[PDB]
């Protein structure tokens, strides 16, 4: 029975490939040959943040584009005032090995997690004035890789147990568990409408999930190695992914296939993070080579390079208003570019 | 805008308080050494933790040696795919790799050798020294002293290996036991020495699960690692 099941799966995968190929009437590269290229843009470090002791792994911009939170594996979670470089809070973490952080859309809560397999929610506006642990989520069986807030009461989490889950903060129980990924889930991105999200799970594939229906809608398998970064296109109809193969790929949720691949001859290192600008024309990706490249989403060329760091780039996030982009690195320093 | 200046002053006061707190945190942090405990589940690593102490994804054991703070992390409740979460420990002082020597018939010794090679040759772990604990020495001694488990059946190079002249055996061990012990030690070493970079070093140690010297051994390896790093910084080594 197993052989017949595998044969049926292979035949239906071949049917999927044939259907996808039939829709490949033309390539995005050919269509975008006419548009004016961005040329060259040279960003400069406008602010430098210092105070973290160990390597910084993750950060998140606020919805107001003023406050941001960054997580360092020394056990400290710090909230920064982007405009004035001041520090608003310095939350001490129970577990030093924090691997993710998140900022609530309303900003009333901050979440983080790591190798402890527990996601802790911190309340920033307690009447006492001090930061306190509001809720602890301990249903996962692996390190927390990523987490993002849907609202003040709903948070989606990524774990190394190969399954994603939706958590009801007030109840503290998993409302829905997403399964189907083979490898460790690394990055999580919520769609602009908050109804869909995508993630790569170290199996060279990206899965599209429905937050309410609790099932996988589409699967993309254009990558060759583990996927470390994922981010939606600003319109929500496409998303870009970063993988260890040193190539970034853009997928469209309606075409159901890769549109183009971003790569170059002399880059042989994996991508750690990826993000889009407000217009979506600029794709910013962090690399293990201590610098971040800027790619033209349409013309498939490098528009600029950010080389303010001297260690591995761990995180990269653009402001909601698109005014500036902040990048973190293992050197324990954050550079804000504009 | 007097309110703006007032809130700016309040923010500066909060920043000063946070700076003082972070300075204290930095002072305490730099004085503490972090260690990673690794090895197969069948190994005696669990007994070592219990001796030194005398569902979470990681366990922390804190002990003081000569009034020196050491933090040890045991990665439990984690999947066997170590290639991702292992990168987090790229800044640890040393990695305590515990391998049971008496594990040759799955051939757990070969798996341990491959894992050690992977950690040593990893891109991000090249800056971390590895403390190699060769555990279960009594089991190996009783297995090789009289038994049918031939080492050459699983390691054919053993038949043409002789104990090095620069070896110090404990008074009373049979020459065959010492030969097997040093063969395993050199098999582990040949992976590390092959790098030739000198950025990190391996410190093999014949160990028993009940040995109380393990704490002293770890202290000595930490001292040696720090001294070698400082000497290489000063171009002495």
């Amino acid at each position: 029975e197993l052989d017949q099941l595998r044969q049926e799966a292979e035949q239906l995968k071949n049917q999927i490939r044939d259907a996808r190929k039939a829709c490949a009437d033309a390539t995005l590269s050919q269509i975008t040959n006419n548009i004016d290229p961005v040329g060259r843009i040279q960003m400069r470090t406008r602010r430098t943040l210092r105070g973290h002791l160990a390597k910084i792994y993750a950060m998140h911009w606020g919805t107001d584009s003023r406050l941001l939170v960054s997580a360092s594996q020394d056990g400290k979670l710090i909230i920064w005032d982007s405009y004035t470089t001041n520090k608003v809070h310095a939350i001490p973490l129970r577990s030093s090995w924090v691997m993710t952080c998140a900022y609530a859309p309303s900003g009333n809560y901050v979440a983080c997690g790591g190798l402890d397999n527990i996601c802790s929610i911190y309340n920033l506006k307690t009447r006492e004035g001090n930061v306190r642990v509001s809720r602890e989520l301990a249903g996962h069986t692996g390190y927390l890789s990523c987490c993002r807030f849907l609202d003040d009461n709903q948070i989606v989490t990524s774990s190394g147990d190969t399954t994603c889950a939706l958590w009801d903060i007030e109840t503290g129980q998993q409302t829905t568990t997403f399964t189907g990924h083979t490898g460790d889930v690394m990055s999580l991105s919520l769609a602009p409408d908050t109804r869909l999200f995508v993630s790569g799970a170290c199996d060279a594939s990206a899965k599209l999930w429905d937050v309410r229906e609790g099932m996988c809608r589409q699967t993309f398998t254009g990558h060759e190695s583990d996927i470390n970064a994922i981010c939606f296109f600003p319109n929500g109809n496409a998303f870009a992914t970063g993988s260890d193969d040193a190539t970034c790929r853009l997928f469209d949720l309606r075409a159901d296939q890769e549109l183009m691949t971003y790569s170059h001859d002399n880059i042989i290192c994996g991508i750690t993070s990826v993000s889009f600008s407000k217009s979506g024309r600029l794709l910013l990706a962090g690399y293990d080579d201590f610098n971040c490249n800027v790619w033209d989403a349409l013309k498939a060329d490098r528009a600029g390079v950010l080389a303010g760091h001297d260690n591995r780039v761990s995180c990269l996030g653009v402001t909601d208003d698109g005014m500036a982009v902040a990048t973190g690195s293992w050197d324990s320093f954050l550079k804000i570019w504009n | 805008t007097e309110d703006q200046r007032n809130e700016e002053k309040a923010q500066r006061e909060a920043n000063k308080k946070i700076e003082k707190q972070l300075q204290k945190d930095k002072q305490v942090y730099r004085a503490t050494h972090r260690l990673l405990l690794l090895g197969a589940g069948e190994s005696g690593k669990n007994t070592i933790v219990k001796q030194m102490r005398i569902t979470s994804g990681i366990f922390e054991t804190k002990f003081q040696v000569d009034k020196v703070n050491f933090h040890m992390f045991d990665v439990g409740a984690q999947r066997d795919e170590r290639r991702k979460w292992i990168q987090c420990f790229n800044d640890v002082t040393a990695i305590i790799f515990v391998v049971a020597s008496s594990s040759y018939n799955t051939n757990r010794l070969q798996a341990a050798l491959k894992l050690f090679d992977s950690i040593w040759n990893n891109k991000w772990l090249r800056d971390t020294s590895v403390i190699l604990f060769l555990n279960k020495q009594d089991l190996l001694a009783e297995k090789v002293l009289a038994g049918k488990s031939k080492i050459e059946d699983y390691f054919p190079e053993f038949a043409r290996y002789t104990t090095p002249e620069d070896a110090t055996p404990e008074p009373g061990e049979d020459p065959r036991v010492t030969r097997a012990k040093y063969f395993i030690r050199d098999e582990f070493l040949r992976i590390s020495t092959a790098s030739g970079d000198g950025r990190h070093y391996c410190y093999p140690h014949f160990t028993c699960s009940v040995d109380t010297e393990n704490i002293r051994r770890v202290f000595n390896d930490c001292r040696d690692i720090i001294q070698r790093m400082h000497l290489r910084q000063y171009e002495l080594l």
Partner: nanobody, 128 residues
Framework: QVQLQESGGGLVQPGGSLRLSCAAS????????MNWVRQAPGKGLEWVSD????????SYTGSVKGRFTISRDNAKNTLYLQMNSLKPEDTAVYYC?????????????????????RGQGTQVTVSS
């Protein structure tokens, strides 16, 4: 999609020889290290032999050293494992596995849990 298709197997009398093959597609074959692993009935995964990108470096497990031969053909994205003088203990399902990253010799393809970059495997039986 990353696909690995092992071929060759069946039953062979002890002391014979067998040729295993591994078709590869969906990735740049030359940029990844490859190795062979096996799982005997009732036993866990075992590493057999590995080959570098260009093949200049080759290694075998002690119980297979000098007995089998691992070779790769980057021109047609195929990997081979020549086996001779087989013994009953060699009976096991042999999986053709590719460990994660290119341009790196660090390699973690012995994990017990389902590995995304290994093929279905082929059964090899050694009996009279």
């Amino acid at each position: 999609q990353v696909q690995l298709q092992e071929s060759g197997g069946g039953l062979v009398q002890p002391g014979g020889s067998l040729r295993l093959s591994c078709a590869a597609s969906g990735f740049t074959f030359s940029n990844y290290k490859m190795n062979w692993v096996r799982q005997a009935p009732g036993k866990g995964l075992e590493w057999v032999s590995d080959i570098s990108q260009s093949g200049a470096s080759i290694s075998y497990t002690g119980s297979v050293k000098g007995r089998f031969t691992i070779s790769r053909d980057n021109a047609k994205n195929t990997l081979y494992l020549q086996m001779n003088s087989l013994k009953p203990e060699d009976t096991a399902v042999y999986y053709c596995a590719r460990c994660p990253a290119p341009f790196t010799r660090d390699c973690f393809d012995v994990t017990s849990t389902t590995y995304a970059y290994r093929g279905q495997g082929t059964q090899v039986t050694v009996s009279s």
